[PDB]
Amino acid sequence: FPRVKNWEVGSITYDTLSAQAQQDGPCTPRRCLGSLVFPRKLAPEQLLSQARDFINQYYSSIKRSGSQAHEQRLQEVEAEVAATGTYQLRESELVFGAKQAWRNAPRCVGRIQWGKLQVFDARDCRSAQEMFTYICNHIKYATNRGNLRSAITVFPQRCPGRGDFRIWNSQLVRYAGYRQQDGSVRGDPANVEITELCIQHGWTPGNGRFDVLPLLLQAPDEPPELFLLPPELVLEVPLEHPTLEWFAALGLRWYALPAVSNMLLEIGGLEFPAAPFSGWYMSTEIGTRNLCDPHRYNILEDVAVCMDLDTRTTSSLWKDKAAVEINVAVLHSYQLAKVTIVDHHAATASFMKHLENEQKARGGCPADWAWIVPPISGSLTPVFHQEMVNYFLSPAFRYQPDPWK
Amino acid sequence: KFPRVKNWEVGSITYDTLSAQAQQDGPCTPRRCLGSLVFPRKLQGAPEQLLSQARDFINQYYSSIKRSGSQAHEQRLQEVEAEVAATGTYQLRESELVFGAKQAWRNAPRCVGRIQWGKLQVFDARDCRSAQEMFTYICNHIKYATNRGNLRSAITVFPQRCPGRGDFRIWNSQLVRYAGYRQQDGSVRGDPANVEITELCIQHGWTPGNGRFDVLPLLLQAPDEPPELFLLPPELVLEVPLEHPTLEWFAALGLRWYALPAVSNMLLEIGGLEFPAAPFSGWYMSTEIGTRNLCDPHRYNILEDVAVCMDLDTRTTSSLWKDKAAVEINVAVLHSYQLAKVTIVDHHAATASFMKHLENEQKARGGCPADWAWIVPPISGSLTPVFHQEMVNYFLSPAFRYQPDPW
Numbered sequence: 001f002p003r004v005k006n007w008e009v010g011s012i013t014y015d016t017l018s019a020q021a022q023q024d025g026p027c028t029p030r031r032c033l034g035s036l037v038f039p040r041k042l043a044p045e046q047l048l049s050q051a052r053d054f055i056n057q058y059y060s061s062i063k064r065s066g067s068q069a070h071e072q073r074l075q076e077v078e079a080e081v082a083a084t085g086t087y088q089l090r091e092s093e094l095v096f097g098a099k100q101a102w103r104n105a106p107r108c109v110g111r112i113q114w115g116k117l118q119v120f121d122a123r124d125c126r127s128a129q130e131m132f133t134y135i136c137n138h139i140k141y142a143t144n145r146g147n148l149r150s151a152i153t154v155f156p157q158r159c160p161g162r163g164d165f166r167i168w169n170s171q172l173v174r175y176a177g178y179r180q181q182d183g184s185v186r187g188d189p190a191n192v193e194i195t196e197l198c199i200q201h202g203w204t205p206g207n208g209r210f211d212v213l214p215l216l217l218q219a220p221d222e223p224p225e226l227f228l229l230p231p232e233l234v235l236e237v238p239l240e241h242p243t244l245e246w247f248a249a250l251g252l253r254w255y256a257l258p259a260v261s262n263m264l265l266e267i268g269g270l271e272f273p274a275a276p277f278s279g280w281y282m283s284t285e286i287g288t289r290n291l292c293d294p295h296r297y298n299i300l301e302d303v304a305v306c307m308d309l310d311t312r313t314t315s316s317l318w319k320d321k322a323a324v325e326i327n328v329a330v331l332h333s334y335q336l337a338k339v340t341i342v343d344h345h346a347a348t349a350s351f352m353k354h355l356e357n358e359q360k361a362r363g364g365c366p367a368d369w370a371w372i373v374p375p376i377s378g379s380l381t382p383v384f385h386q387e388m389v390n391y392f393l394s395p396a397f398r399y400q401p402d403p404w405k
Numbered sequence: 406k407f408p409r410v411k412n413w414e415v416g417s418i419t420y421d422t423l424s425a426q427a428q429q430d431g432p433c434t435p436r437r438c439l440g441s442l443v444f445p446r447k448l449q450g451a452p453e454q455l456l457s458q459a460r461d462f463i464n465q466y467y468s469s470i471k472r473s474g475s476q477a478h479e480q481r482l483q484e485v486e487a488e489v490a491a492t493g494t495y496q497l498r499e500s501e502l503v504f505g506a507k508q509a510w511r512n513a514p515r516c517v518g519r520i521q522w523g524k525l526q527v528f529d530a531r532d533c534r535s536a537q538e539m540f541t542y543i544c545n546h547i548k549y550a551t552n553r554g555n556l557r558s559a560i561t562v563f564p565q566r567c568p569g570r571g572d573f574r575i576w577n578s579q580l581v582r583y584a585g586y587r588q589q590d591g592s593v594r595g596d597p598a599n600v601e602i603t604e605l606c607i608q609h610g611w612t613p614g615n616g617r618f619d620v621l622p623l624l625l626q627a628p629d630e631p632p633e634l635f636l637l638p639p640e641l642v643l644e645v646p647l648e649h650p651t652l653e654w655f656a657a658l659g660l661r662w663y664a665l666p667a668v669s670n671m672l673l674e675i676g677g678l679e680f681p682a683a684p685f686s687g688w689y690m691s692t693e694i695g696t697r698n699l700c701d702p703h704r705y706n707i708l709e710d711v712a713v714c715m716d717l718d719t720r721t722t723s724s725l726w727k728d729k730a731a732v733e734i735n736v737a738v739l740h741s742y743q744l745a746k747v748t749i750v751d752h753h754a755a756t757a758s759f760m761k762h763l764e765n766e767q768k769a770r771g772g773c774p775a776d777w778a779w780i781v782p783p784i785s786g787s788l789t790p791v792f793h794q795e796m797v798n799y800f801l802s803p804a805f806r807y808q809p810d811p812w
């Protein structure tokens with residue numbers, strides 16, 4: 001078992017949970033590929049073993065291992081798989097599986113929250129219009145006027161003979177990115193492709209920097225259908241800075257609800273290609289990545305010039321000073337708007353507690369160091385000094401191919 | 406296959422074909438990645454194996470100088486084969502030593518400074534016989550490398566390990582280290598990283614100081630002898646008092662650091678030969694001092710002191726008081742080293758040069774071993790280009806390796 005050391009405190013643990021890793025990552029003894037964004041490519045006997053492992057996980061979690069109920073469920077799944085090629089989760093299993101998939105997500109620093117997840121069962125959904133109803137109710141619930149609640153809506157599983165439900169958008173709220181003739185982008189460069197797809201499917205584009213995109217929702221064996229989110233459903237936070245009064249004149253904003261909509265939820269061998277989940281933001285996602293990445297909104301140099309910093313030389317650390325003030329603006333602004341947000345110090349401190357909890361509960365915790373350590377102030381947070389073991393457990397959230405490629 | 410490597414800021418793709426030549430194995434498997442572990446397990450302690458590494462190294466060298474298959478290449482292979490058959494080991498020509506030292510630096514996956522790898526002064530101390538002579542070589546190294554603040558990269562190579570004879574070892578992890586004194590309540594005065602070496606110095610007859618920045622003596626070990634204590638002449642040890650360009654009280658904190666980072670506890674491996682004492686030096690990247698050495702909770706841990714002096718709100722994390730204090734400490738380090746005319750590189754400039762290194766190496770060797778977690782600076786990670794660069798980590802030889810402490 002891997003020996004895992006915390007270098008700030010000197011404490012050592014062994015990750016025995018890693019021995020239960022259900023899938024291969026990209027590393028080998030000859031070379032580590034832990035820094036790759038995409039670590040992977042993108043039946044009945046294999047389905048059964050994954051189903052049985054999941055059922056065993058479920059009955060262990062409720063302290064009913066070996067019960068008549070545990071045995072009946074194993075037999076039932078085995079017989080349903082033999083008779084139909086697949087099986088159906090019970091509602092309690094779906095809830096357990098969604099929470100486990102979150103708990104198992106190595107790149108998520110928010111997992112101290114994993115037990116608190118509202119699971120909306122949309123496995124009866126039959127149309128894109130109904131998907132939009134479920135999505136709008138999810139957004140309303142999760143937003144909760146700014147007191148954000150973690151939630152997942154689970155649409156019907158993949159099944160043979162039938163196309164997938166898919167949400168083409170990578171998140172439920174995305175700002176349009178409009179590519180300009182000189183190669184530049186107006187709006188969010190991360191969303192140029194989904195923006196062009198929306199336009200190709202009839203959306204009349206805006207021309208602002210923070211135009212909320214419509215949803216492209218795909219029902220089985222149907223082209224995607226375009227749905228506009230009612231603007232009163234999309235809570236947004238205008239960004240200002242508590243002591244840099246011109247900052248508000250930048251016209252920057254971000255949305256309250258991070259709701260990831262393009263990942264595949266895998267439970268017990270069953271695949272849910274549409275299972276959007278939302279929580280709340282860690283401020284560096286907005287203030288550091290979304291606003292200061294050179295290939296995103298890239299506001300760093302404008303902010304530094306407005307702060308009267310000397311941007312001619314790197315050694316004044318104008319980039320660092322400007323980035324800190326932008327993160328302050330995000331934190332101050334979400335708090336002023338009474339929208340749940342967590343700074344990276346509080347978040348990483350809670351993740352350390354989560355690692356402690358998971359060592360006792362499961363003997364380890366899969367974690368992706370490069371994603372857990374925040375993008376500013378890395379070694380000022382406890383996770384920087386914490387060795388981590390990255391491995392794939394199921395249930396899981398997984399990347400999946402885009403449905404237009 | 407060959408790992409596909411993407412830069413996510415610009416979208417450019419490379420394939421790392423060099424990783425297919427990786428010699429030793431790392432700690433990762435398909436089941437779980439251990440890339441974040443400081444010690445990728447292992448450590449240190451047949452003519453066939455040595456001859457195999459020697460030939461691969463000689464072949465590497467003669468390829469690098471465009472003389473593969475030449476008469477000189479064949480003659481050198483035969484010399485090495487004949488030396489190992491006669492003596493069980495062999496001797497590097499001085500040109501091969503220099504090449505080997507530079508390649509070991511080039512191959513170091515955790516070094517962000519490798520754009521400099523071809524500029525390395527190599528002092529050949531393989532004739533060294535005594536700890537006293539080791540001290541003379543070390544002082545000359547420090548004097549050359551310090552160069553009155555105009556730091557020059559250098560390595561001094563002491564005699565190789567050989568059967569039936571102890572190693573030369575420098576016990577200190579760096580040539581310049583500040584003492585760490587354990588207090589009666591368990592706290593540390595000075596650098597907590599150096600408590601163990603400080604106590605070893607006291608054990609071997611060093612009269613300790615009681616300051617926060619006492620430069621430690623050197624414990625130098627000649628083969629089969631106990632380590633010998635040597636005091637560095639204070640005029641050899643250039644130090645920079647830390648001040649801040651605008652925070653006038655910062656100077657009164659009495660913080661300082663030394664000019665010369667000179668790593669003295671790593672093993673240099675070239676063509677199967679092992680040099681357990683081969684201290685190397687360059688110059689600092691400022692985050693090493695301002696972020697890690699001074700702000701790590703288990704190092705000097707001064708961040709909250711500085712935040713107090715800055716009148717920051719320190720009982721709400723979301724004021725980002727830690728981040729603001731950290732930046733000003735890094736500003737103070739940069740300002741102070743530039744004021745003292747001591748070479749230093751900020752983390753923006755260093756990571757930008759490392760991207761250029763990656764580009765040079767892709768053309769030169771088809772790849773570059775890099776350890777993402779160590780290349781990305783400990784503050785402002787995604788503000789630097791390396792954050793957005795996928796990297797492949799693997800072990801090439803020649804190499805600098807960790808080795809067990811000699812005691």
Ligand code: HEM
Pocket residue numbers: 098102105107108109110111113117150151152277278279280281282285342347371397
């Ligand atoms: C409740 C507050 C939460 C916070 C503060 C939080 C924080 C984060 C952050 C900062 C990341 C890195 C994202 C990036 O850099 O792109 C992340 C990733 C992730 N989160 Fe959480 N999260 C929360 C809730 C959730 C929930 C409710 C789920 C699912 C039920 C979830 C599943 C994931 C997954 C699967 C990833 C990996 C995404 C990827 O690989 O691209 N998180 N989270």
Ligand code: HEM
Pocket residue numbers: 506510513515516517518519521525558559560685686687688689690693750755779805
């Ligand atoms: C010339 C300026 C140089 C700069 C700015 C530089 C910068 C750095 C930094 C920031 C690290 C990480 C150290 C840490 O965080 O503890 C590092 C590691 C390293 N450097 Fe360089 N370096 C330079 C020169 C050199 C030279 C001359 C050598 C050897 C000949 C070298 C070999 C290494 C090695 C082997 C490591 C890995 C250390 C470890 O694994 O503990 N560097 N360097």
Ligand SMILES: N=C(Nc1ccc(CCNCc2cccc(NC(=N)c3ccoc3)c2)cc1)c1ccoc1
Pocket residue numbers: 037110258259260277278279280281282285
């Ligand atoms: N897919 C492409 N790259 C690409 C770019 C970025 C990513 C990271 C996606 N993470 C978004 C995300 C995921 C999970 C959590 C968050 N945050 C939250 N707080 C949160 C969200 C829900 O609950 C909490 C945010 C992944 C891939 C690509 C390739 C070509 O074009 C585009």
Ligand SMILES: N=C(Nc1ccc(CCNCc2cccc(NC(=N)c3ccoc3)c2)cc1)c1ccoc1
Pocket residue numbers: 443518666667668685686687688689690693
């Ligand atoms: N020593 C312990 N841990 C420990 C602590 C630190 C390390 C890594 C040390 N890197 C020092 C280093 C190495 C290479 C480069 C630099 N910087 C430079 N710019 C530089 C130096 C030479 O040329 C440029 C600095 C490794 C292990 C320990 C273990 C148990 O108890 C205590």
Ligand SMILES: C[C@H](O)[C@H](O)[C@H]1CNc2nc(N)[nH]c(=O)c2N1
Pocket residue numbers: 035036037370371372413792793794795796
């Ligand atoms: C190349 C590198 O893996 C990539 O930029 C990663 C690094 N760590 C990250 N960490 C988080 N949380 N989010 C990210 O998008 C990334 N990107």
Ligand SMILES: C[C@H](O)[C@H](O)[C@H]1CNc2nc(N)[nH]c(=O)c2N1
Pocket residue numbers: 007384385386387388441442443778779780
């Ligand atoms: C646990 C983790 O690997 C450890 O804290 C690493 C992270 N990255 C680092 N990067 C550098 N340059 N130096 C370090 O000491 C570390 N420490």
Ligand SMILES: [Gd]
Pocket residue numbers: 243244245
């Ligand atoms: Gd102001």
Ligand SMILES: [Gd]
Pocket residue numbers: none
């Ligand atoms: Gd005062």
Ligand SMILES: [Zn+2]
Pocket residue numbers: 027031032033034433434437438439440
């Ligand atoms: Zn790995």
